[PDB]
Design a protein around this ligand. Structure first.
Ligand SMILES: *OCCCCCCNc1c(NCCOCCO[C@H]2O[C@H](CO)[C@@H](O)[C@H](O)[C@@H]2O)c(=O)c1=O
Ligand SMILES: *OCCCCCCNc1c(NCCOCCO[C@H]2O[C@H](CO)[C@@H](O)[C@H](O)[C@@H]2O)c(=O)c1=O
Ligand SMILES: *OCCCCCCNc1c(NCCOCCO[C@H]2O[C@H](CO)[C@@H](O)[C@H](O)[C@@H]2O)c(=O)c1=O
Ligand SMILES: *OCCCCCCNc1c(NCCOCCO[C@H]2O[C@H](CO)[C@@H](O)[C@H](O)[C@@H]2O)c(=O)c1=O
Ligand code: CA
Ligand code: CA
Ligand code: CA
Ligand code: CA
Ligand code: MN
Ligand code: MN
Ligand code: MN
Ligand code: MN
Lengths: 237, 237, 237, 237
DNA sequence: AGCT
DNA sequence: AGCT
DNA sequence: AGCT
DNA sequence: AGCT
């Protein structure tokens, strides 16, 4: 199956698979059972920002999720991604709903990756920035229920015409180009991802969450991965 | 056929298809017969730099080609690319040889494109920078004789084991992601490309040249486009 | 006197010094009497965006001023800045009021300048981006009535405690670092500036405007340059 | 006195002030006695690269120093710079010689700093890149013996016409603009610095080293700070 | 830019 | 490299 | 682009 | 929120 590294914004506690009993952010290394979590004060109907960073010096994957004028949540985990991911990856956003639901609306997404060669000390870099999504966004691979262009946003999961989120939905968007995320012959490598999101639910319990993820290039939504599996994992192992 | 906009670095005068009688840089709009040329003092065996710029305000495609401590060649042409290219494109480098030959070696390639929306005044951007090419460069589409990784360079046309360039060769490299090069609903848009190149010919007269090009996403090398057609055009019309 | 190149967003027609009879954008080369103008449909109380671009290949100074979901105004003028400005400059924003008034509020300002050496083909670059201004913004030189930090904005001209703009006010903000805007030994050079602005007038007719300008490093507000002189020029010559 | 945070490339063991008995890289927090060091295989006469990184999420200052095709040295130290530096700083390079000497030649210097506001989630950024230094580099403050333009390089300490380094020399270069390095109201902040250097000595023991530093804006070379104090500290406390 |  |  |  |  696929190889996944992800930062999850998990709106729904699935205590049966080791979620904490509160909405949380997590670092997922090849499992939906986060290697590290932090409590997250998700604000229903508010636009939030997620920031994810990693470099090959510290080998610490860190995320910050925040809303304007509120305290941020942060989670960090030490991991050598050279030992986890393939050298070449795709990067993407994923989201799901299950019995309970929410909008999984992405208003912006940026990514930057850099590799400096040990042999020449010259740098290879990729950067993309989406502040608006068009109805035909040819540099995004849309999987499952994901759609673009509705008010210039990326709707990862199904929403009705009047903005009501639907249950049992999963969708993802991957950047078209493969990304060279590590190289043994690189002296320094880094990436950063940022996205803005709007999670809104009429349900007393919103579900299930949004994730930024890094995968094998040919990654697809695993069969059955609605709800707690966030469109990333084939099972809850 | 494909739709091509290109900046040619033409090392071989084909006077029978309207080339000037000297090595030259040109702007090619849907024809190998340049809309505009400038004289180019190509320096056999020296690393040079090409810089290509366009924005939606001036709608003037401009190029500068130079070698360190020499005077540059510059060519400009007014063209509304909204009336020539599809909205979504790929960008690439092309080169060819014919009965005369040369190395068509690319040492670096960078590209930046930006679109600012009329409705939100927010910007979408893409940037890539290759200062080294690997043996398996998954974010490049290699066509024809193009190879990567030989001394960390992109060799657009065939070079033998003994290092000598081959005749009748054509090759191209395209960036994997489609590029949104214009949008009627963009208030301002721009792109810039830069590459560094090394053209070496032992065989007296070098041929045929290198081009930076913008094409339909599904562009392929036209069959028989060796020599004066520079891997870009199916004929000399 | 100082040496000024500016893009004016002129909200008040001064027909006695050669303004057109409508609010307009202009290119000012060493005179308040614009070398080129375009009609500008200024929208009282709306946030707008100005984009200014120049490169050493085309030597065409261009500006686009627009509001979301409205048609832009654009103005261009061919000028070799090597023959007008000193090699080293400061860049700034200026605004004024006179017997008529307006808020001259700056919400964001970004600037990028690049110089590529003819001898090495290596690039020197400067970039700054202000999306918020603090009460003590040590990388800005504030002149005249300019203040920062009020709602995170840069107020170029005086606004009273009750929020109403004052007449006969002039103020400017310059970036602290000198900028190398041209070099004879540069093979390619460029700059771009962007700012967002909010011009509000209760007093019927708004005056006088905002300008982006480039000056000698030691530029100061010319004494008496309120009203039609836009904080840039000592007289209307 | 001044407040200094520095990354030292220390070529000369001063065991009397707690240097290790080998050339080393160090993190200096308000003292020449490094809070952390790593062994450094300095290569006399070779061009090296230094990379320094910090962000407000991890609050870990890290450096990597390397030469092409050799193993890098890395040093990291956990420090909350909000508790060390003033909010506004200058950034610079410093170097010294004493009884023993070396060239302290800087071939390139880049710096990037970003602050994201907790209230708006908008970013303020500064970036500069010097790949060549001119004889009159108006955006650098040169202190002590530092000179620019000799072969397009920054010579931090004194060198003769034939390239022979001089003893008892100290010099620094600071970027002209103040830098907003931390803000309590910033949700995420980062900086990165890179420079390339050429340390060459005819002496069996080269001395004394190069440092990247962050200081109070009005920082000057302390009296007597040649040799082991690297132009940064007034004493060896 | 619109009213006298 | 000097000083104990 | 230079030699016959 | 259900299941023990
Ligand atoms: O009355 C509303 C109050 C809050 C309700 C939250 C329940 N608390 C709770 C659960 N229990 C249920 C485990 O989830 C069952 C539903 O499973 C389906 O729906 C979810 C959400 O969409 C999805 O994750 C699943 O995959 C599945 O589709 C806890 O463990 C806990 O805490
Ligand atoms: O100052 C510049 C002088 C350089 C040589 C000028 C022309 N040399 C030349 C020609 N010219 C006729 C056209 O070329 C015929 C050969 O055509 C094949 O080779 C070229 C080069 O690779 C290619 O462009 C064509 O498409 C074709 O493959 C000669 O016959 C000769 O010698
Ligand atoms: O469609 C556009 C119509 C807007 C009003 C047109 C003119 N209005 C106007 C004039 N015109 C004469 C010139 O202005 C005289 C006042 O001058 C002072 O005020 C202006 C504005 O702040 C300033 O530019 C000058 O430098 C001076 O401070 C009137 O007299 C009147 O009413
Ligand atoms: O024959 C050469 C072999 C290597 C010589 C290195 C000495 N080893 C050593 C020292 N001892 C001397 C302490 O430094 C004395 C000189 O001080 C002056 O020169 C240095 C270098 O320029 C400078 O740092 C000082 O500030 C002063 O100007 C150790 O402690 C160690 O190891
Ligand atoms: Ca969950
Ligand atoms: Ca040709
Ligand atoms: Ca006016
Ligand atoms: Ca030392
Ligand atoms: Mn979870
Ligand atoms: Mn041609
Ligand atoms: Mn005017
Ligand atoms: Mn030390």
């Amino acid at each position: 199956a696929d190889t996944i590294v992800a930062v999850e914004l998990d709106t729904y506690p699935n205590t049966d698979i080791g979620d904490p009993s509160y909405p949380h952010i997590g670092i997922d290394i090849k499992s939906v059972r986060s290697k590290k979590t932090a409590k997250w004060n998700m604000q229903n109907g508010k636009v939030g920002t997620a920031h994810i960073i990693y470099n090959s010096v510290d080998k610490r994957l860190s995320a910050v999720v925040s809303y304007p004028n509120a305290d941020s949540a942060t989670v960090s985990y030490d991991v050598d991604l050279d030992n986890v991911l393939p050298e070449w990856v795709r990067v993407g956003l994923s989201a799901s709903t299950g019995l309970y639901k929410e909008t999984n609306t992405i208003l912006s997404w940026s990514f930057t990756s850099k590799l400096k060669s040990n042999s020449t000390h010259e740098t290879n870099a990729l950067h993309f920035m989406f502040n608006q999504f068009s109805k035909d966004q040819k540099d995004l691979i849309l999987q499952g229920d994901a759609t673009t262009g509705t008010d210039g946003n990326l709707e990862l999961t199904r929403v009705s015409s009047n903005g009501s989120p639907q249950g049992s939905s999963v969708g993802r968007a991957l950047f078209y180009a493969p990304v060279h995320i590590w190289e043994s012959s690189a002296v320094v490598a880094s990436f950063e991802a940022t996205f803005t999101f709007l999670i809104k639910s009429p349900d007393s319990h919103p579900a299930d969450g949004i994730a930024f993820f890094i995968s094998n290039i040919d990654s697809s939504i695993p069969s059955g991965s609605t709800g707690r599996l966030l469109g990333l994992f084939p099972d809850a192992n």
